[PDB]
Design a protein around this ligand. Structure first.
Ligand SMILES: OC[C@H]1O[C@H](OC[C@H]2O[C@@H](O)[C@H](O)[C@@H](O)[C@@H]2O)[C@H](O)[C@@H](O)[C@H]1O
Ligand SMILES: OC[C@H]1O[C@H](O)[C@H](O)[C@@H](O)[C@H]1O
Ligand SMILES: OC[C@H]1O[C@H](O)[C@H](O)[C@@H](O)[C@H]1O
Ligand SMILES: OC[C@H]1O[C@H](O)[C@H](O)[C@@H](O)[C@H]1O
Ligand SMILES: [Ca+2]
Ligand SMILES: [Ca+2]
Ligand SMILES: [Ca+2]
Ligand SMILES: [Ca+2]
Ligand SMILES: [Mn+2]
Ligand SMILES: [Mn+2]
Ligand SMILES: [Mn+2]
Ligand SMILES: [Mn+2]
Lengths: 232, 232, 232, 232
């Protein structure tokens, strides 16, 4: 049993266990602020520094995992509160796309909206170019920000959201339970075959992005995670 | 939207919010103890007092939910660690099976292993009459202790186990993640139509059982739960 | 080469290898509950029945021990979570001080806070009369609850805490390491000359107390111990 | 609260969480074998992949850590039962010494015994060139295999040994508790300033070596670890 687990109640610039990319920043309170409010097309991403072996080519066994995190998206004048956050899974060599425009790409794809990754996105801006629902939403993404599936949701400015994700290898099911400010849960599940979509080794993390007129605070407050790959 | 959220840090058999059936007892430390270690074919169960409306005959909507709980199973001389714990959902009028032989029925089915309920079992004994895996296991049961699906698990005596369950109405999936002592995680998911297997009004709870030579300590420590049904 | 080792995964007041002093009871789950929630100034202690030789009056040698135990402390309505647990070493004829007032004395000292012992305390109520720090803390005590040194700590109700203690004769150093709920560790060390503060034969154990308004669950889940006295 | 914690009950050729240097090899049973029996002056080391930040340049705070593990040293026909196993901390760029001659350098220092590391050695051969005690022994080394302090010990062929170390950052005390096969314990402590002897980012692991005439099986069976640095 090859297992990976950790728990962050706060963060601090300096911990080698974390990989910072782009305009990421660690506030004084311990929170991670993914984007810069004075930059255009800002993009910041945080990843667990250590790669996770989600599946073996030898045994063909895929790992299952449980994870929970919490974030916040406070509005600021006078920009459009966009574009949101996305928890994602990518190859360990992953970097912010070359010449990223941020915006509706959430920092994980090119302009077309494609890229190499898997993710649960929290959209606060309806990008019609990526077939985005009309209202805020939660989506399951696979190599594209044009979600394979999405569900209506609402991002309350200054609210702290609680999220729980469960991946079951046996069924390739990716479950997401989102708990809003008002104690109401929201959920979206989807069968995503990770062994088919990503390499044996990957990195998990968070990405947020903005643009010219679309900007907002993107805070990642906590994150606990555990993954287990059977080796027998 | 219709929501129901509650959280139990510790229990008290003098609390109206919970129904106590069988030989359930609440130890001075707040712990719920399902089986009586002294009794034979001891059956103990707990249910949340107020029924939860998991679906509408008017709208046809099914509710999604996120509930988590921690329990503990510990051995004793000179019996066999048995039989197990099971998180179940059933009709609001549910009661322990008439003339319950406890044992491998986890106190929710009849001798043939059939009852009206959907739940997640935590098996510590391999009953062949119910086609059980040769080892300890976690199983998804739908009206029978002859699990729809199962996963090799390991019940470590004296260890506090954390369990997280997600029910996505849309896909009808029931995902489960269990954290062991060795820090490794175990998961199991399975599509189940609550709407087709259960009434619109149900009750959630826990139940355990023992036999003649099969007995062990079954303790439910904490339990949080939130479910939301859309009415629009 | 004189060694004394044992291991308790659970307890039972039947087994005589342990003295039961005070309001201590043993729950059906095998947890040694040290205080009586319904009593005022309750005090309950537990000692390993066999006295341990921690130093020879022949060689002048002192023993080294490695011991680890796990406890739990949980709040209760509607009293202040008090007062704490203390692992301690004392003369084999040790008993709860005469007319103990529980509370901050932790059941090991008299009113002023003086007693004949040595232990690691897990204090959960700042007692100014005993120069207690402002928050919960772990302290090393020598014939007094006015700790020789303490370190900031936090008690999480219902949380199962693990502790590992090492005592090195050569350096007369007592090193503690607390493993909290969240996963973080808290340590504290202090040079304590055992052969100078106690007699050849002593008894190891736990204690806990309470007052009129200070009450809470003080459990002892497990306990392993190994000591070795060089006789060569 | 910056914390790093993991737990290996076994290992696997392929886990990204572990760096393998030298003759290291992973056995079919999960053990790690540090030295190659058919090689001269063999050297094999295993390290925790992620670099650990033991102290901060900003807060001047040094972290504390708890860690335990078990290993096995078995004889072979018909080489000399040498040289031993060392648990150490070193700069994140630590590599097997250049031109390493193995033997009594335990693969962590040069021919004169010097090196940049901190660790607990389990010496099974007496190297007078490093001022070694005459009998098997455990020692606290600081940039040298000429131990800062040692304690008589005994390496029993085939025996599984359990070790627990505690580093209290405040007193800067490094404490070690070893448990021979016969259940007896051996302890050794010594103040060591990590903030002074090592950089901010270091790595933990195990090392072992042999010579042309001295060889033996060095196995690392398990390893758990928790370090915490105070950010506030
Ligand atoms: O809250 C529980 C607490 O109760 C006591 O606290 C000391 C208390 O004594 C009364 O004499 C004084 O009037 C008041 O000012 C003091 O605060 C108990 O001593 C303490 O250990 C704890 O149980
Ligand atoms: O006004 C906000 C809006 O601005 C653009 O049109 C960007 O492409 C979108 O992603 C969004 O940020
Ligand atoms: O040994 C215990 C075992 O005994 C039988 O075989 C019962 O049918 C099981 O349910 C279990 O209680
Ligand atoms: O006999 C074995 C012995 O051989 C030499 O003398 C080496 O220097 C030692 O490290 C040890 O390996
Ligand atoms: Ca968008
Ligand atoms: Ca069974
Ligand atoms: Ca106090
Ligand atoms: Ca040597
Ligand atoms: Mn979208
Ligand atoms: Mn079963
Ligand atoms: Mn104190
Ligand atoms: Mn040496």
């Amino acid at each position: 049993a090859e297992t990976v687990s950790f728990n962050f109640n706060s963060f601090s610039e300096g911990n080698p266990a974390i990989n910072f990319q782009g305009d990421v920043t660690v506030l004084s309170n311990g929170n991670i602020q993914l984007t810069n409010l004075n930059k255009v097309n800002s993009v910041g991403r945080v990843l667990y520094a250590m790669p996770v072996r989600i599946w073996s080519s030898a045994t063909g066994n895929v790992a299952s995992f449980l994870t929970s995190f919490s974030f916040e998206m406070k509005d600021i004048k006078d920009y459009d509160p966009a574009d949101g956050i996305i928890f994602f899974i990518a190859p360990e060599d992953t970097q912010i796309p070359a010449g990223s425009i941020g915006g509706g790409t959430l920092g994980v794809s090119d302009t077309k909206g494609a890229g190499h990754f898997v993710g649960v996105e929290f959209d606060t801006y309806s990008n019609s170019e990526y077939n985005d629902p009309p209202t805020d939403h939660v989506g399951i993404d696979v190599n594209s920000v044009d979600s394979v599936k999405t569900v209506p949701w609402n991002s309350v400015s200054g609210a702290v959201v609680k999220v729980t994700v469960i991946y079951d290898s046996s069924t390739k099911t990716l479950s997401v339970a989102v708990t809003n400010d008002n104690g109401d849960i929201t959920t979206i599940a989807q069968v995503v075959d990770l062994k088919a979509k990503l390499p044996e080794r990957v990195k998990f993390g968070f990405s947020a992005s903005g643009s010219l007129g679309g900007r907002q605070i993107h805070l990642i407050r906590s994150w606990s995670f555990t993954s287990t790959l059977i080796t027998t």
